[PDB]
Amino acid sequence: LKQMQVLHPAARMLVELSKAQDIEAGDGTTSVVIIAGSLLDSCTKLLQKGIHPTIISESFQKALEKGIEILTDMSRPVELSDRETLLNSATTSLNSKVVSQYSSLLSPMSVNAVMKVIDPATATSVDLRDIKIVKKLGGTIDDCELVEGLVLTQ
Amino acid sequence: PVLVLSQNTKRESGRKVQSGNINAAKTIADIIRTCLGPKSMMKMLLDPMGGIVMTNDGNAILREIQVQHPAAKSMIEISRTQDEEVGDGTTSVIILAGEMLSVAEHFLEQQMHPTVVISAYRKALDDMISTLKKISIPVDISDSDMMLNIINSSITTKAISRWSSLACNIALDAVKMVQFEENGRKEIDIKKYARVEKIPGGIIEDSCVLRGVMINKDVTHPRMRRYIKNPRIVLLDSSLEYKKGESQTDIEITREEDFTRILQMEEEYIQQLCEDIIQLKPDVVITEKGISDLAQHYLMRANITAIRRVRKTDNNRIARACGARIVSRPEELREDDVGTGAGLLEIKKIGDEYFTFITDCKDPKACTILLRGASKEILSEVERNLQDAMQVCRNVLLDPQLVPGGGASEMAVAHALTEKSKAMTGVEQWPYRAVAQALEVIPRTLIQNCGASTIRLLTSLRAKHTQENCETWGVNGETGTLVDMKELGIWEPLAVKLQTYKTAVETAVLLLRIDDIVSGHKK
Amino acid sequence: EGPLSVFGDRSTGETIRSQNVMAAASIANIVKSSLGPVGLDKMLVDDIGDVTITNDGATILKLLEVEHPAAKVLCELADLQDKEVGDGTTSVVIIAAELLKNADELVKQKIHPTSVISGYRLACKEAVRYINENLIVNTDELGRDCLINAAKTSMSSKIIGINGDFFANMVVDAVLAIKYTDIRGQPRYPVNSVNILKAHGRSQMESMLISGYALNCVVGSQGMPKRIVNAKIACLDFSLQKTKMKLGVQVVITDPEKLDQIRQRESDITKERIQKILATGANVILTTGGIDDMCLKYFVEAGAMAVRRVLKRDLKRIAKASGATILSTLANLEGEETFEAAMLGQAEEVVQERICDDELILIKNTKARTSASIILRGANDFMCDEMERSLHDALCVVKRVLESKSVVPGGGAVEAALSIYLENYATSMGSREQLAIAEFARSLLVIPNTLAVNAAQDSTDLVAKLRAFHNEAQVNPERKNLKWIGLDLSNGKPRDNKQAGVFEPTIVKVKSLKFATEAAITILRIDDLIKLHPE
Amino acid sequence: VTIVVRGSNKLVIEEAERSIHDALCVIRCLVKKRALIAGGGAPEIELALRLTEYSRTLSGMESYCVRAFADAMEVIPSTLAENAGLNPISTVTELRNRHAQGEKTAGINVRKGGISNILEELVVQPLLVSVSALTLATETVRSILKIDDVVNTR
Numbered sequence A: 001l002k003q004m005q006v007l008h009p010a011a012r013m014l015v016e017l018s019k020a021q022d023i024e025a026g027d028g029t030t031s032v033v034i035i036a037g038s039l040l041d042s043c044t045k046l047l048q049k050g051i052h053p054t055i056i057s058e059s060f061q062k063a064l065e066k067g068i069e070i071l072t073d074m075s076r077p078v079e080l081s082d083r084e085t086l087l088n089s090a091t092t093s094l095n096s097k098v099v100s101q102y103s104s105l106l107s108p109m110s111v112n113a114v115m116k117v118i119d120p121a122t123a124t125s126v127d128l129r130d131i132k133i134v135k136k137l138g139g140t141i142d143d144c145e146l147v148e149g150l151v152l153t154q
Numbered sequence B: 001p002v003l004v005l006s007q008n009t010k011r012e013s014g015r016k017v018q019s020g021n022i023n024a025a026k027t028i029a030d031i032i033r034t035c036l037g038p039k040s041m042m043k044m045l046l047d048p049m050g051g052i053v054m055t056n057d058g059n060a061i062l063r064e065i066q067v068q069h070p071a072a073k074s075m076i077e078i079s080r081t082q083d084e085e086v087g088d089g090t091t092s093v094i095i096l097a098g099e100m101l102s103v104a105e106h107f108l109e110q111q112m113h114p115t116v117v118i119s120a121y122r123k124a125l126d127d128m129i130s131t132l133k134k135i136s137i138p139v140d141i142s143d144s145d146m147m148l149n150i151i152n153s154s155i156t157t158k159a160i161s162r163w164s165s166l167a168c169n170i171a172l173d174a175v176k177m178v179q180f181e182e183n184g185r186k187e188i189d190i191k192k193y194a195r196v197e198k199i200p201g202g203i204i205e206d207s208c209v210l211r212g213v214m215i216n217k218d219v220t221h222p223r224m225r226r227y228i229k230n231p232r233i234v235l236l237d238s239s240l241e242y243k244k245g246e247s248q249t250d251i252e253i254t255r256e257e258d259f260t261r262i263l264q265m266e267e268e269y270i271q272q273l274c275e276d277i278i279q280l281k282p283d284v285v286i287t288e289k290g291i292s293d294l295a296q297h298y299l300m301r302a303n304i305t306a307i308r309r310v311r312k313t314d315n316n317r318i319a320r321a322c323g324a325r326i327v328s329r330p331e332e333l334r335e336d337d338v339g340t341g342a343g344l345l346e347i348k349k350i351g352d353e354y355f356t357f358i359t360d361c362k363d364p365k366a367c368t369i370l371l372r373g374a375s376k377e378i379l380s381e382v383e384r385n386l387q388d389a390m391q392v393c394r395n396v397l398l399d400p401q402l403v404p405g406g407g408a409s410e411m412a413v414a415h416a417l418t419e420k421s422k423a424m425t426g427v428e429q430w431p432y433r434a435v436a437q438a439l440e441v442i443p444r445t446l447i448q449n450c451g452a453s454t455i456r457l458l459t460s461l462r463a464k465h466t467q468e469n470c471e472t473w474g475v476n477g478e479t480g481t482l483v484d485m486k487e488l489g490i491w492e493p494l495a496v497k498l499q500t501y502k503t504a505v506e507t508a509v510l511l512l513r514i515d516d517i518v519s520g521h522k523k
Numbered sequence C: 001e002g003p004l005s006v007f008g009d010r011s012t013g014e015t016i017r018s019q020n021v022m023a024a025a026s027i028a029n030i031v032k033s034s035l036g037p038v039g040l041d042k043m044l045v046d047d048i049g050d051v052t053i054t055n056d057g058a059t060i061l062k063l064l065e066v067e068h069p070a071a072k073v074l075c076e077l078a079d080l081q082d083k084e085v086g087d088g089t090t091s092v093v094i095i096a097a098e099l100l101k102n103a104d105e106l107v108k109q110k111i112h113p114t115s116v117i118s119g120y121r122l123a124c125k126e127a128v129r130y131i132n133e134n135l136i137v138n139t140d141e142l143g144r145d146c147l148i149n150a151a152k153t154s155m156s157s158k159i160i161g162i163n164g165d166f167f168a169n170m171v172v173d174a175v176l177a178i179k180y181t182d183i184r185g186q187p188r189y190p191v192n193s194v195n196i197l198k199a200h201g202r203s204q205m206e207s208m209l210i211s212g213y214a215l216n217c218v219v220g221s222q223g224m225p226k227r228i229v230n231a232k233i234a235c236l237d238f239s240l241q242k243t244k245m246k247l248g249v250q251v252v253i254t255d256p257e258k259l260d261q262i263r264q265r266e267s268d269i270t271k272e273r274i275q276k277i278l279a280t281g282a283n284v285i286l287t288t289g290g291i292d293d294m295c296l297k298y299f300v301e302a303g304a305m306a307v308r309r310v311l312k313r314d315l316k317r318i319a320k321a322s323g324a325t326i327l328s329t330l331a332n333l334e335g336e337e338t339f340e341a342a343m344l345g346q347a348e349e350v351v352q353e354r355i356c357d358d359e360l361i362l363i364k365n366t367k368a369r370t371s372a373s374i375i376l377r378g379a380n381d382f383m384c385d386e387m388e389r390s391l392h393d394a395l396c397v398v399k400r401v402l403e404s405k406s407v408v409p410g411g412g413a414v415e416a417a418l419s420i421y422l423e424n425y426a427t428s429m430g431s432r433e434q435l436a437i438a439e440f441a442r443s444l445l446v447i448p449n450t451l452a453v454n455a456a457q458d459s460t461d462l463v464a465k466l467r468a469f470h471n472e473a474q475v476n477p478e479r480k481n482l483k484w485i486g487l488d489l490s491n492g493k494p495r496d497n498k499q500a501g502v503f504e505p506t507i508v509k510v511k512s513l514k515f516a517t518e519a520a521i522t523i524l525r526i527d528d529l530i531k532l533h534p535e
Numbered sequence D: 001v002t003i004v005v006r007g008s009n010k011l012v013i014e015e016a017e018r019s020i021h022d023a024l025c026v027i028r029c030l031v032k033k034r035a036l037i038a039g040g041g042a043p044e045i046e047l048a049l050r051l052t053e054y055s056r057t058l059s060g061m062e063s064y065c066v067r068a069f070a071d072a073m074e075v076i077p078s079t080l081a082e083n084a085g086l087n088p089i090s091t092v093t094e095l096r097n098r099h100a101q102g103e104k105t106a107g108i109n110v111r112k113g114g115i116s117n118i119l120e121e122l123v124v125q126p127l128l129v130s131v132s133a134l135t136l137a138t139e140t141v142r143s144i145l146k147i148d149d150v151v152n153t154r
């Protein structure tokens, strides 16, 4: 969405929406835009039937309040000491990209990094500026590695 | 829009490329083939600056032409490489390459792959070399008459043949005066110590080689002597004047006496400098930089003659001739660096202009050649001919071997290859013979320029070379008959022939491997 | 369009896919005619009139101008193959293009691209695993013969083809002369430390190998000697010019009597340095900076050679070879400046040679270590440049063979064996990956076809014969030795290429397969193109 | 800690770096909220089902709007069925039928090519992703519904 140049003022808000998700979650950047488009599409028939936009907004708020409760009731608690769940979550988040074939190499590394930066007993958030990514041409994707030290380019 | 992939690059491929390359090479060869042999005619060309080049040399013709087809560029380049390597034979190489490339399309059009032709040519080149070395003749370099004969045989084709016995001598002397051995065992005949000075006017018979050097300069002050009998010469690389340093120097004065004081010290500096020269008691001072007037005053008081602003090349030649060496600080001037090998210094006028001659050296290792003539173009052609002659002399001095001229070597090698080819089987037999029959374009051309019947003379010569000992028979390029090169006396060095054959065959091999062309690709 | 105001152009669906494939195909069609001992060369002319003659895939693809991304990908693939290995930069493009074409043929049918990608990955992994059965240990063979055959095989199809034996011996000697003595865990062979110089003139059979080093430089002044028998060499990294004070320092004079002694000092300091160098018996001085004419006279009087404006890398190689030490200053661990005799190199001879109207410098028989250089003679500049480009490939191939002790037959034995094996192995999967594996196996077969087509032979029959022989090799174990029968192009028949002496490093095949598969996978995933308008 | 990323091209290197960032942000989300949920389109179809049931309770125009909200949540499963070459109508009907009679972890299996339990395939995702996506989408739609004019300025 950022690389294109959308000209319509409405379509210039959707991109911002995706940005917000990237800040909050880092995943689901496509799904939020799909959902927003679907809701705005459904609003057309309601407008034609003679509904007022204010009533539509209030009903959407009510539906959101119910949906959050339903989703929360769906969930299942997890503990950081179980590495299998973290590996499954990472490999699920990773099997939609070009590097899915290398997941059996990239899935553990990621997890390792997050467990080498935080203190699991009191971790309430993670600072990703403590993990540095270095891009080096040559070789194949099968050559990515994790360095527990310092890497310099000069 | 305009969906593209390569941005207006032009591509060609197929047999059309090979045919075009061969045609371009033959077209290049066609311009020149009238300038081979002692009956050649000249050509005049106009350069982008308005001058005129009336010449007969193949390289001098080819390097004045602008062309677009790359094959022509390759041919011009091989011409200039032949000129640089040995200095002679820049016409026969072009014709030979053209013929060897022409006799290949007959096989290319009969569904034969180029690699087979390449292998056959490379196989034939080695046998050409061996046969050339087989019929060689040694020469004794201490016999001056034989060396004059070789040089003359080299210059009977050019425009100065009318004065051959003159030019020959000149060339020989020059080379004999530059051969030089130094620390180690390295011998050199470097040709940057044999300078050719041209002065229009007079007559050509007055041209000579000086035992010394000649410069276009005059004495700095009129009272300096213009005629010294046995001078002692010092050469300087520095300036005899007061200059500024480079360390960001400034002066701040507050007293009355300082200013004048400073202006005096400069002069004092000059004085001691001049003294450091006068302590060696010389007669001539030569420098590449300027000379101040106060220095001229002191030197004249010491009875010295000074010259200014001579080029570095001229200073090096003077150092090599008189026997001195160049000094940049007078305080480190010794007696060993003073040249005492000269025999005369004179300053003359040659047509409203002053020239300086340093002549009568005891044993100079550098010389100068003074040419007179009608105008600039004639003197330029004479200069080119002298360059050819001196290069031939150097080649024969570095490799004392000789081979017959007039077409004897070509027919001998062709007969040897023809006799050897009947011991082989396979397709490569047919290209292998072709190059052999491509060596007969040298005698044929000669005959065509003499105005004789090539169809009968060529078959008579071929029949003559079939016999057992007739390896020196050739064509008399002035009358149009068959004659033995032993009696006519046309011999040429082996190095020139080897280079000619190698360059021609390798150019053919290079041009036979192209298969497509891509153009306009923006670097 | 209507929706999605984008002020650009959007393409979607099979259209773009087909377009992409065509682009790749075009690139292959440029180089398909320069493969094998029978293929020919190309001539490239720019807008101003420079001519380049070559049949190197990397050079051709680098000199061309391209703008379709699907072709720039292949150009960068060729560059990467050149950097990592140094050989086989033409075959990798052909392999990648054929893989892409065969995959698009399946994707036109309703086969999902992910299945094709997974099948390609599986086939590549299994092929790389299986190649390690076709290996030959070069120590089992006679080492010199294996090295010579590898170099001569690499040199075929180049301008130095028929001269394979002469240049092969030269290359092997030059490579062996550079072997360095590491920790001794493994030896190392730093090629491109061997200098290559070009000079047109005599035939190419007069190219020479120098046991020492060659400098494209000349002596500083014409008064110096030009041959030293027993050479003591001092390498310097600073200019010998009259000293000037730095930016901070300036001269202010209030008493005139003190001026003159200042101006002498600028000309004296540098002199005091030169004597310190010359007092230890140094004969040859090499400098990366300049040397003033005032300072050349000291060397001239002392009878010594001085060369200025020497390249840094040449100085490093000379100093390492002769045992000297590079100095950027004379200062020691005390306040003063000294030059010791223990930081001098020794060479057995230093000459200034003349080659075809120019001059250069030879340093022969260095004593600390052995070094090499090559001088190449040819008809003109285009020919010499092509020979240098050809020789680089052979040097790299010999280096790879020495470092990794394994060789593989050539001519198409590997492609035929892998095609047969993968076609057989695809039966066990029994899924939609079977089709992708079969297409991988069929796409591997384009190399022998191109080799036979360039030779104007019957490609179909020859490839059928190869496949039949290798099938008889894979079953019937008593005939296992049929996995080496390659291809003979000068007669049009198979021949045992292991005994014939056609070899190549296995790393070439491995890296080519891996890189080609990666490129095909990364291009096979695009279903939408958006091209924005210029600003 | 440092990660060194290798590849044969610039484009694949960039995509690999983006994928690794995706996985890292997913693990960070798991750290922030210790909760897990099933993927594969299950949350959207269950949301649509429960909101359709909830719509019957409400009375008046509001009810219509709630129903529309539900019908805007089945776009995600349908898309997932379309991209895999499956029949969307049958797949979504079977999903709704299986979610309406008990188990709430059913989803689309692309390996099997049908509908099955999703936890048996080990595809899971955090809850924060879904909650944040829904909340941001609803807020953006409510913001869009407030606009009734466009003015061109300098």
Ligand SMILES: Nc1ncnc2c1ncn2[C@@H]1O[C@H](COP(=O)(O)OP(=O)(O)O)[C@@H](O)[C@H]1O
Residues within 6 Å of the ligand: A027, A028, A029, A030, A031, A032, A092, A095, A096, D039, D040, D041, D108, D109, D110, D123
């Ligand atoms: N193996 C799988 N089987 C079925 N669905 C999957 C699988 N992996 C991921 N998904 C689904 O893909 C959806 C989003 O994938 P993705 O393309 O990354 O979109 P986003 O970037 O918006 O998360 C998720 O809802 C998840 O349920």
Ligand SMILES: Nc1ncnc2c1ncn2[C@@H]1O[C@H](COP(=O)(O)OP(=O)(O)O)[C@@H](O)[C@H]1O
Residues within 6 Å of the ligand: B035, B036, B037, B038, B040, B058, B088, B089, B090, B091, B092, B093, B153, B156, B157, B404, B405, B406, B407, B446, B475, B476, B477, B478, B490
């Ligand atoms: N008197 C002569 N009779 C026959 N041939 C001659 C005679 N003089 C020179 N030649 C031949 O002319 C050729 C030299 O050609 P020339 O026109 O001088 O240009 P180039 O030397 O560059 O080929 C030599 O091969 C030589 O054999």
Ligand SMILES: Nc1ncnc2c1ncn2[C@@H]1O[C@H](COP(=O)(O)OP(=O)(O)O)[C@@H](O)[C@H]1O
Residues within 6 Å of the ligand: C034, C035, C036, C037, C057, C087, C088, C089, C090, C091, C092, C153, C154, C156, C157, C410, C411, C412, C447, C487, C488, C489, C502
């Ligand atoms: N003597 C030979 N006989 C048969 N095939 C050969 C021979 N020499 C080289 N080849 C083949 O030529 C191919 C290499 O072609 P080449 O022009 O060197 O380009 P590149 O190696 O860069 O792809 C190899 O696959 C090899 O099998």
Ligand SMILES: [Mg+2]
Residues within 6 Å of the ligand: A027, A028, A029, A093, A096
């Ligand atoms: Mg995602």
Ligand SMILES: [Mg+2]
Residues within 6 Å of the ligand: B088, B089, B154, B157
């Ligand atoms: Mg001549």
Ligand SMILES: [Mg+2]
Residues within 6 Å of the ligand: C087, C088, C089, C154
């Ligand atoms: Mg190759």
